[PDB]
Tab-separated table of C-alpha atoms in Angstrom:
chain	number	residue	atom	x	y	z
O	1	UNK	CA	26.363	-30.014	-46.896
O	2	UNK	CA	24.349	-27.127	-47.910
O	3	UNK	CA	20.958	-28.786	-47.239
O	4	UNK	CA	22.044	-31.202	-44.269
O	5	UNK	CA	20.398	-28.089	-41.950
O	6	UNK	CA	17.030	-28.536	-43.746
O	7	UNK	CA	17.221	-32.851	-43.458
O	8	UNK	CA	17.478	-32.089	-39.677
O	9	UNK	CA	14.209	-29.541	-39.440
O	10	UNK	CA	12.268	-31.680	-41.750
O	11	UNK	CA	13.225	-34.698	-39.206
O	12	UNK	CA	12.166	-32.740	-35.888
O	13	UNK	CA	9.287	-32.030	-37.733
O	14	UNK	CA	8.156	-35.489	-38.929
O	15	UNK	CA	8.995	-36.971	-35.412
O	16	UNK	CA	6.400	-34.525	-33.522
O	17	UNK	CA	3.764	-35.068	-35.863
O	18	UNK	CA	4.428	-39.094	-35.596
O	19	UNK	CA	4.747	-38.357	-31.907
O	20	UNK	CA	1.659	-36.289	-32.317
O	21	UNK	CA	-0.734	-38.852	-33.437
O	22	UNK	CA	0.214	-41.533	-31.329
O	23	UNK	CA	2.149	-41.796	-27.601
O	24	UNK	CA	2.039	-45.413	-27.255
O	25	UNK	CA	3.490	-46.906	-30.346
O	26	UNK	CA	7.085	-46.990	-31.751
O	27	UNK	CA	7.869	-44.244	-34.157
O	28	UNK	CA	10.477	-45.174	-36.719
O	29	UNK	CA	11.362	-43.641	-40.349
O	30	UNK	CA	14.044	-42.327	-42.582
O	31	UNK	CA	14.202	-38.671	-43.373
O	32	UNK	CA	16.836	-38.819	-45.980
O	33	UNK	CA	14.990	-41.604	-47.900
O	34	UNK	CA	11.603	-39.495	-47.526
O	35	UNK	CA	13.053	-36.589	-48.768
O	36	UNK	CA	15.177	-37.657	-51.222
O	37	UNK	CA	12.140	-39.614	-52.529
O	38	UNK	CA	9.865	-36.299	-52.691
O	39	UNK	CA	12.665	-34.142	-54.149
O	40	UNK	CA	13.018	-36.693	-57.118
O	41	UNK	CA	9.002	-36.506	-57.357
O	42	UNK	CA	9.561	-32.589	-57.789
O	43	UNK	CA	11.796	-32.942	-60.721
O	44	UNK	CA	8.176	-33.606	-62.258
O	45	UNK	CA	6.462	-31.020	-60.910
O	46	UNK	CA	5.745	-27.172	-61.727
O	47	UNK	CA	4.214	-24.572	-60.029
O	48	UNK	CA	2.737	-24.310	-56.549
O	49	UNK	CA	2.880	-28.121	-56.756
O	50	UNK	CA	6.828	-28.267	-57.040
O	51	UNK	CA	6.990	-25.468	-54.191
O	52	UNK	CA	4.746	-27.004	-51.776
O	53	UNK	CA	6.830	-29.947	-51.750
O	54	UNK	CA	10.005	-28.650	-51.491
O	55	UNK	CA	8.811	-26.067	-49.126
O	56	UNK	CA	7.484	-28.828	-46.978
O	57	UNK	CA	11.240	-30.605	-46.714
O	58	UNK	CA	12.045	-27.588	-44.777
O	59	UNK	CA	14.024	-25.930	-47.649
O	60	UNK	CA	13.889	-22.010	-47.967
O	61	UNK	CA	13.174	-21.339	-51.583
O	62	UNK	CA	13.723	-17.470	-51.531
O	63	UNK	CA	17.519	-17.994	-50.104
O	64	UNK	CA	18.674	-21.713	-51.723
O	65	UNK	CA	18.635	-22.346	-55.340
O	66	UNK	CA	16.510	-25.393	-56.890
O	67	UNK	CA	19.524	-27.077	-58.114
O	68	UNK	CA	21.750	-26.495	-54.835
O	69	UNK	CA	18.891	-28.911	-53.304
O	70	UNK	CA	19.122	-31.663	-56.502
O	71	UNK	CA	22.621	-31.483	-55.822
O	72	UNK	CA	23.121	-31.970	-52.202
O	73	UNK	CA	20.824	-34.742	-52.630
O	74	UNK	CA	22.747	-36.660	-54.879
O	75	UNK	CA	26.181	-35.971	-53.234
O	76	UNK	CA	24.509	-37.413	-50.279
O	77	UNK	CA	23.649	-40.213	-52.262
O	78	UNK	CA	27.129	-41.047	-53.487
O	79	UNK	CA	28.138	-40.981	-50.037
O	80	UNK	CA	25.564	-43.918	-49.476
O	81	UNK	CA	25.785	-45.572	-52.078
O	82	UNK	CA	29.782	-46.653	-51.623
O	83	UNK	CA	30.729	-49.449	-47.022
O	84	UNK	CA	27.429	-49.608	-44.615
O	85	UNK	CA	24.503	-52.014	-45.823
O	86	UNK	CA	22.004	-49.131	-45.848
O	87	UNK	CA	19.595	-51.285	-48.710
O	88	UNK	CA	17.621	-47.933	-50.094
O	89	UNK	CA	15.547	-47.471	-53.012
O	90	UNK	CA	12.884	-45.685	-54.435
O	91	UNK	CA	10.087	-46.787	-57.052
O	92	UNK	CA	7.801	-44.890	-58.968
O	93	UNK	CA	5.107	-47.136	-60.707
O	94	UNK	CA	2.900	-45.755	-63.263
O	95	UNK	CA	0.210	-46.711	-65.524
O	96	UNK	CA	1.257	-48.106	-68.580
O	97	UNK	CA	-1.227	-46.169	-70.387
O	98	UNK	CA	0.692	-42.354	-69.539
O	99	UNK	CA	3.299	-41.310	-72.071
O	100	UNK	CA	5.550	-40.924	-69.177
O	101	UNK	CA	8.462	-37.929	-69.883
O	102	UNK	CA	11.718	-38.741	-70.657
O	103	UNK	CA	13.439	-35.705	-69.094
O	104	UNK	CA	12.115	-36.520	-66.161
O	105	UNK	CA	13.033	-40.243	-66.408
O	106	UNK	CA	16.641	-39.350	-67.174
O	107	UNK	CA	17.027	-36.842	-64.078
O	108	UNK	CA	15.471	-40.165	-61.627
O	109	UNK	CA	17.647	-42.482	-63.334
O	110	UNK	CA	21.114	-39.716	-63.174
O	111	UNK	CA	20.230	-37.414	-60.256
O	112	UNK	CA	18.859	-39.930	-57.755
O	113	UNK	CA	19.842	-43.568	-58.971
O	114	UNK	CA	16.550	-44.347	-58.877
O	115	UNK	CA	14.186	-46.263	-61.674
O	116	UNK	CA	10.799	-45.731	-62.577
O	117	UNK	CA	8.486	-48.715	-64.094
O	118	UNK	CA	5.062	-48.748	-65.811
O	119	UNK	CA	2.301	-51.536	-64.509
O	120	UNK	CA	-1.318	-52.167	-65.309
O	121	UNK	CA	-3.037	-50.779	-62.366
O	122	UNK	CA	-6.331	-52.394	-63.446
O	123	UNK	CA	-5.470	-55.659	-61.488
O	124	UNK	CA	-5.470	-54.657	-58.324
O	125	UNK	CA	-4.537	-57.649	-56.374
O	126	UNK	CA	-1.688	-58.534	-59.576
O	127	UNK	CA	0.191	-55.212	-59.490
O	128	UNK	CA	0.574	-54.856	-55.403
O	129	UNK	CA	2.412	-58.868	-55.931
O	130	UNK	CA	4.595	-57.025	-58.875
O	131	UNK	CA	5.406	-53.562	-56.583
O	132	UNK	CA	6.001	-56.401	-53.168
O	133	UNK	CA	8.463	-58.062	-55.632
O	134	UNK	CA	10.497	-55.543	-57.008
O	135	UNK	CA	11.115	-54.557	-53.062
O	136	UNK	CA	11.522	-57.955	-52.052
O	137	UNK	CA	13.570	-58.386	-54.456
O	138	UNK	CA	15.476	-54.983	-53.971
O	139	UNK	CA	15.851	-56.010	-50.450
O	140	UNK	CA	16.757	-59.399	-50.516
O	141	UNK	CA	13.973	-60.623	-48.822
O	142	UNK	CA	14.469	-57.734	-45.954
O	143	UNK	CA	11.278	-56.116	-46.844
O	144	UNK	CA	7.855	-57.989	-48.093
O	145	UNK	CA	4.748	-56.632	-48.283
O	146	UNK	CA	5.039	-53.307	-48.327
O	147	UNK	CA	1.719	-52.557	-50.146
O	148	UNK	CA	-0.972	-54.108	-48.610
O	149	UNK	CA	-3.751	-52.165	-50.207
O	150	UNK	CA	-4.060	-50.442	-53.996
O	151	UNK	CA	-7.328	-48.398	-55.049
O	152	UNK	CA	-9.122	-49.599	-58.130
O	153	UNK	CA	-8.374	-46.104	-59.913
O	154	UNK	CA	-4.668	-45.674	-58.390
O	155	UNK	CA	-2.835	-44.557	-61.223
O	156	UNK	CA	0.549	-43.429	-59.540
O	157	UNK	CA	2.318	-44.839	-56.651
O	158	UNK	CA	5.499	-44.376	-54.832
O	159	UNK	CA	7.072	-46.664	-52.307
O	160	UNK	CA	10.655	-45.552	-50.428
O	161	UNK	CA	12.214	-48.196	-48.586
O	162	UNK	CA	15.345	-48.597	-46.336
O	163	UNK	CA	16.859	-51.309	-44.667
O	164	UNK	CA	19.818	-51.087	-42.295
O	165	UNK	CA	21.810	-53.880	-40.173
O	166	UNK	CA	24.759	-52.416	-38.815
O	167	UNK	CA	28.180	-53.657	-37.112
O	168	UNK	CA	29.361	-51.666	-34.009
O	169	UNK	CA	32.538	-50.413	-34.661
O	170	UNK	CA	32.901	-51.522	-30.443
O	171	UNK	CA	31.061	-54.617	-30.106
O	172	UNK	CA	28.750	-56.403	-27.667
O	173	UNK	CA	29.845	-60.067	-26.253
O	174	UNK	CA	26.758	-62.337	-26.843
O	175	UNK	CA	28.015	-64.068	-23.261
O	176	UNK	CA	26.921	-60.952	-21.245
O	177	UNK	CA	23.416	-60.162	-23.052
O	178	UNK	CA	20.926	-60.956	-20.540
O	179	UNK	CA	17.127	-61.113	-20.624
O	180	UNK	CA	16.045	-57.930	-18.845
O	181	UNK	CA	12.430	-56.466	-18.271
O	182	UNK	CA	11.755	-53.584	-20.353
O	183	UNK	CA	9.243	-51.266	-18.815
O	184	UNK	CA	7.040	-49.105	-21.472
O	185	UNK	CA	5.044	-47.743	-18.836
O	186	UNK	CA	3.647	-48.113	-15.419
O	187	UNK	CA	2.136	-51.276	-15.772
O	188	UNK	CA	3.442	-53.401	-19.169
O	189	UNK	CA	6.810	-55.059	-18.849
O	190	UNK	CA	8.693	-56.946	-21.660
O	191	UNK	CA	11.110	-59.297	-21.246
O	192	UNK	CA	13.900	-58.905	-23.552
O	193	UNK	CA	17.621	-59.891	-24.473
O	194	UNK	CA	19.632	-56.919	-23.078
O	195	UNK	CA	23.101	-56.781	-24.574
O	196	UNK	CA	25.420	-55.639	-21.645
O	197	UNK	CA	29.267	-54.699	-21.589
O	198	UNK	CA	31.010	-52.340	-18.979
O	199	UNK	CA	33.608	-49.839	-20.764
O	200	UNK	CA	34.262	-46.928	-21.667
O	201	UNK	CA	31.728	-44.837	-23.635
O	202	UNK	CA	30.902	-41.171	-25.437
O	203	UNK	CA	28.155	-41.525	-22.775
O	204	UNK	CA	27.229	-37.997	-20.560
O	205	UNK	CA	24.404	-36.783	-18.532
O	206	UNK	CA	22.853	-33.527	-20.575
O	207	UNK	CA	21.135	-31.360	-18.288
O	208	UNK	CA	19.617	-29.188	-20.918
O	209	UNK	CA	17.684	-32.650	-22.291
O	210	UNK	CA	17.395	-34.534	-18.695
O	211	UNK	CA	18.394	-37.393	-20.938
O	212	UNK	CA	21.268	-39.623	-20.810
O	213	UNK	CA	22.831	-39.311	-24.587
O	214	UNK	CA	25.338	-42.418	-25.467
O	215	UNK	CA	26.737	-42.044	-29.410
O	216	UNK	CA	28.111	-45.539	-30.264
O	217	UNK	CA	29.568	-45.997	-33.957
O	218	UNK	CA	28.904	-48.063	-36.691
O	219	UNK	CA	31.474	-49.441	-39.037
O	220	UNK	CA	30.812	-47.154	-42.567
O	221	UNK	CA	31.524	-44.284	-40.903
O	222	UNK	CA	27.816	-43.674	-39.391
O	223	UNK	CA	27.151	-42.497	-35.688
O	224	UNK	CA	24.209	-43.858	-33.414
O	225	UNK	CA	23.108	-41.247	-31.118
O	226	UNK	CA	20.911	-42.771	-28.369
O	227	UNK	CA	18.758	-40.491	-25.819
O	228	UNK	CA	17.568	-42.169	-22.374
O	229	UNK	CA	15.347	-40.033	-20.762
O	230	UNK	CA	14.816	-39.520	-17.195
O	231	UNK	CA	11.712	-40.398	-15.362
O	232	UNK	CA	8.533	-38.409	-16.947
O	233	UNK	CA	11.066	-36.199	-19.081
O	234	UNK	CA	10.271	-37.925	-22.465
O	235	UNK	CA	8.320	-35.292	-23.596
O	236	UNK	CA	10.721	-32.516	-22.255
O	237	UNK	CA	13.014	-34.349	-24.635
O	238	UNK	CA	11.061	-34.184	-27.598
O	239	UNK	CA	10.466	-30.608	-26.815
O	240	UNK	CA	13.835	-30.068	-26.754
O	241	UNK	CA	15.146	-31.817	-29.650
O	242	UNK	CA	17.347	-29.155	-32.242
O	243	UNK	CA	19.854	-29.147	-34.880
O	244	UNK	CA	22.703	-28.141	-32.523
O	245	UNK	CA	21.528	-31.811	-30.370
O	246	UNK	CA	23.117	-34.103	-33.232
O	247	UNK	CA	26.511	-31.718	-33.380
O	248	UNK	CA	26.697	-31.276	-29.513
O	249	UNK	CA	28.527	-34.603	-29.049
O	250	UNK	CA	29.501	-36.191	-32.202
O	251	UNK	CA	32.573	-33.978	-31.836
O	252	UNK	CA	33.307	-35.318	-28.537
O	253	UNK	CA	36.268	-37.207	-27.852
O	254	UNK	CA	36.114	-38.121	-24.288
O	255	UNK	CA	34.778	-41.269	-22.509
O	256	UNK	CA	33.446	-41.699	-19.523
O	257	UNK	CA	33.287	-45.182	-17.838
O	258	UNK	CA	29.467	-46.612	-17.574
O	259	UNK	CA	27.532	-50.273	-17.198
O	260	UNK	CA	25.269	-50.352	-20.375
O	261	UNK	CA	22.289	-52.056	-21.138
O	262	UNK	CA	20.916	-51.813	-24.150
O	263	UNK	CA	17.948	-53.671	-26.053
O	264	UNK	CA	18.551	-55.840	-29.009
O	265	UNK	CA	16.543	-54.807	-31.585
O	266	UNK	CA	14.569	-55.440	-34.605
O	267	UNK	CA	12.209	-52.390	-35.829
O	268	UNK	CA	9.976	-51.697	-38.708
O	269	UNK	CA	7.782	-48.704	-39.411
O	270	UNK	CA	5.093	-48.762	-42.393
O	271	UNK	CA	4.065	-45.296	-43.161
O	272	UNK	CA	1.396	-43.610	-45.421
O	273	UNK	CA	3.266	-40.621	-47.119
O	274	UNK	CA	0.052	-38.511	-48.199
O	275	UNK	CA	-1.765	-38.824	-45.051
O	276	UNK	CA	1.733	-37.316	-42.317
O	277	UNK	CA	3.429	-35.381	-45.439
O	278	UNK	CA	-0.406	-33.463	-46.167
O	279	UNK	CA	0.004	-32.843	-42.177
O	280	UNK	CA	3.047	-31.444	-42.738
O	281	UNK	CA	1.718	-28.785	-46.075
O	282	UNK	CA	2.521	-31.220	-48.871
O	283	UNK	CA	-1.250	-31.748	-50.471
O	284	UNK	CA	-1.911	-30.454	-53.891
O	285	UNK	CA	0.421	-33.204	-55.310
O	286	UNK	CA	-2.260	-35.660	-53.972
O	287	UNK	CA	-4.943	-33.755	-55.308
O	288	UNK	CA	-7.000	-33.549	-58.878
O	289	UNK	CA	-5.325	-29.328	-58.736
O	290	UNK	CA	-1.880	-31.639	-58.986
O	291	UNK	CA	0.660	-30.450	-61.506
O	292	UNK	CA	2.784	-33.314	-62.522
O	293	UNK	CA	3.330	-32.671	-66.152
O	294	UNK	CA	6.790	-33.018	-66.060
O	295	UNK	CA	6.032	-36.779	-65.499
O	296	UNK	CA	3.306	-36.844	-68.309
O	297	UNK	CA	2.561	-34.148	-70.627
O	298	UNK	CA	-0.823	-35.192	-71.864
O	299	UNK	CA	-2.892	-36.174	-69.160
O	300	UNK	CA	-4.044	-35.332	-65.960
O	301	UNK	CA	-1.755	-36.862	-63.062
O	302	UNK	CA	-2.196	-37.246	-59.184
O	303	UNK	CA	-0.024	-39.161	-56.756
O	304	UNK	CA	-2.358	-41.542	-55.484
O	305	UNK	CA	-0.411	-43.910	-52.987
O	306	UNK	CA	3.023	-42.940	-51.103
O	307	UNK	CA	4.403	-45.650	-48.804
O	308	UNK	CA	7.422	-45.570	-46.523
O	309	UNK	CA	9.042	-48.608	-44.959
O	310	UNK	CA	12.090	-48.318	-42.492
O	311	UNK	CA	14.086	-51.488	-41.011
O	312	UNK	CA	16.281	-51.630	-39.363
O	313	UNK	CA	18.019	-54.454	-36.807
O	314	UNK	CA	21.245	-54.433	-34.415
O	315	UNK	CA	22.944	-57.210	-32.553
O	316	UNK	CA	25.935	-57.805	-30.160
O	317	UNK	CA	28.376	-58.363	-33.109
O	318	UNK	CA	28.223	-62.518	-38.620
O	319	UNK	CA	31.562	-63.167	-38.064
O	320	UNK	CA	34.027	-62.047	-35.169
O	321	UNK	CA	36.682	-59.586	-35.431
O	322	UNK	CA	39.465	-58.164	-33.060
O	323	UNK	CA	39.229	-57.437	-29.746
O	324	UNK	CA	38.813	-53.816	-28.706
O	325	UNK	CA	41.724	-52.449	-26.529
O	326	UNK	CA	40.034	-51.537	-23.599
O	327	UNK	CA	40.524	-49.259	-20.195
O	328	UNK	CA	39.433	-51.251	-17.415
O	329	UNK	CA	37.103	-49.286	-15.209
O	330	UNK	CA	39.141	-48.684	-11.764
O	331	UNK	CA	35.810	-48.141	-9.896
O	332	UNK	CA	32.161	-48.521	-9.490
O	333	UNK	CA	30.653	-47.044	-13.129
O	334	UNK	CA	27.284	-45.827	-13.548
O	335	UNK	CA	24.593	-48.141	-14.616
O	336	UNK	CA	22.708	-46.748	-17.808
O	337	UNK	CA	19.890	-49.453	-18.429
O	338	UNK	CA	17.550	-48.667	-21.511
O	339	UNK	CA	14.835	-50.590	-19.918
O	340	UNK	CA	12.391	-47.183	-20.426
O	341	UNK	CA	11.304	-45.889	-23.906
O	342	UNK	CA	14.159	-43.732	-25.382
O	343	UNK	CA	14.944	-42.035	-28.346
O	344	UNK	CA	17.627	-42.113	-30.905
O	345	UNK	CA	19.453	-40.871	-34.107
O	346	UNK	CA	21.438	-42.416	-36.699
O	347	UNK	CA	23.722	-40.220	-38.264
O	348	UNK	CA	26.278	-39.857	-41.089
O	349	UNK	CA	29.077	-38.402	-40.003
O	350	UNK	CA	30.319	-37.307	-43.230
O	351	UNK	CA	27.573	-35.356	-43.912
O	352	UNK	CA	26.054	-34.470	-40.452
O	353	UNK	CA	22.233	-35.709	-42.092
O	354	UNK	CA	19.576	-37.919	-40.351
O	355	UNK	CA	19.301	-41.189	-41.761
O	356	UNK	CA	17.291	-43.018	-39.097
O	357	UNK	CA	15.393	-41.098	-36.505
O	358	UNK	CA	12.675	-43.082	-34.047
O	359	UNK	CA	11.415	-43.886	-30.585
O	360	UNK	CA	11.352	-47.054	-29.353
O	361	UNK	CA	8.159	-47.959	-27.031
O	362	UNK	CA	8.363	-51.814	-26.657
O	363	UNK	CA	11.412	-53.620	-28.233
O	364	UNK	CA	8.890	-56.281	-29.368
O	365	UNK	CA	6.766	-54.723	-31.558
């Protein structure tokens, strides 16, 4: 778990420039399947080009060794790879023209599990049908057009994509979920299912945040960390958002009684890699100064597109299980409705790492 410190930086990082840019729409991406993608990409790289990116992940060159990184990531990977859904790829298309490297095609296809593919980048409107079918196809039909726009003179593109439907390990009882109003600010209100079950919960009141934080599991051994914020403290919570946040609770094993109300949920985020990575210090691999000649030795390479797609969806409960044993609350509990924007965390436990990090503005969108 040598670089599970640097996943977490490189999160808090893409989150505040995604928060940056915008304050009224939903943030949502995966920064192990962005920087698992870019690390692969690096494997192809040389120079300031292979420094830059790896330096932009958040990863200390002068104090961790290049193949400590390639390592973690793929130890990560096997982790993944195993009971949770967690659907994740990543493709790298390239013209069929470019002798393409075959050390560098062996470490995507060992390293990272991941497969590369040549296509005729001259059709335009042909190849972004072949790169939406591979990923439809990867996804079974989770994800569809996730290119929605290829340059006449692309000539290397990479698309990451995750999808994620997970089972609580305590579930929700589709009797109780009630359409509640969700309020995303001062004057819009949603209406929207809100699953609701009194219990027992990981659920606390952190001062240091002025957030509620509730962790609720998943089955696959992979924590949900969800942050309420109180009124006009969302940005205090951003502010305050650290490493030591995702480790302050996971290792709690007290409950405190609470009324819950939480959102179903269905959320996507479509993201162009070159334009928040280049905020973020990553640009010469986008540029003509690129060096990518571990990918091709012969010709001139740049990365022309980079796409990320994140889904993810969660429901009361598929098929039923067992009832939870549960301690009945002997008095009045507290009533922690999500019916604000909030922010949350999805986290492996076996590794610590971020696998889903995002705000949710309107449930709807």
């Amino acid at each position: 778990n040598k670089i599970t410190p640097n996943l977490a930086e490189f999160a808090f990082s893409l989150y505040r420039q995604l928060a940056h840019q915008s304050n009224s729409t939903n943030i949502f991406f995966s920064p192990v399947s962005i920087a698992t993608a870019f690390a692969m990409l690096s494997l192809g790289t040389k120079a300031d080009t292979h420094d830059e990116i790896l330096e932009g992940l958040n990863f200390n060159l002068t104090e961790i060794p290049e193949a400590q990184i390639h390592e973690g990531f793929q130890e990560l990977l096997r982790t993944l790879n195993q009971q949770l859904q967690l659907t994740t790829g990543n493709g790298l298309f390239l013209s069929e023209g470019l002798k393409l490297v075959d050390k560098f095609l062996e470490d995507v296809k060992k390293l990272y599990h991941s497969e590369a593919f040549t296509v005729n980048f001259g059709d335009t409107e042909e190849a972004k049908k072949q790169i939406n079918d591979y990923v439809e196809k990867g996804t079974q039909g989770k994800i569809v057009d996730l290119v929605k726009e290829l340059d006449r003179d692309t000539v290397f593109a990479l698309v990451n994509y995750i999808f994620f439907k997970g089972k609580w390990e305590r579930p929700f009882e589709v009797k109780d979920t009630e359409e509640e109003d969700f309020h995303v600010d001062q004057v819009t209100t949603v209406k929207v299912p809100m699953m609701k079950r009194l219990g027992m919960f990981n659920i606390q009141h952190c001062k240091k945040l002025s957030s509620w934080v509730l962790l609720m599991k998943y089955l696959g051994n992979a924590t949900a960390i969800f942050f309420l914020p109180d009124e006009g403290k969302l940005q205090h919570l951003e502010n305050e958002l650290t490493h030591d946040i995702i480790t302050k609770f996971l290792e709690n094993e007290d409950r405190r009684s609470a009324s819950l109300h939480l959102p179903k949920l269905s959320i996507t985020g479509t993201y162009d890699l070159k334009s928040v990575l280049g905020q973020l210090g990553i640009t010469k691999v986008f540029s003509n100064g690129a060096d990518l000649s571990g990918v091709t030795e012969e010709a001139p390479l740049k990365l022309s597109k980079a796409v990320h797609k994140a889904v993810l969806t969660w429901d009361e409960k598929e098929a039923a299980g067992a009832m939870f044993l549960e301690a009945i609350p002997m008095s009045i509990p507290p009533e922690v409705k999500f019916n604000k924007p909030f922010v949350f965390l999805m986290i492996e436990q076996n590794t610590k790492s971020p696998l889903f990090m995002g705000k949710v503005v309107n449930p709807t969108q």
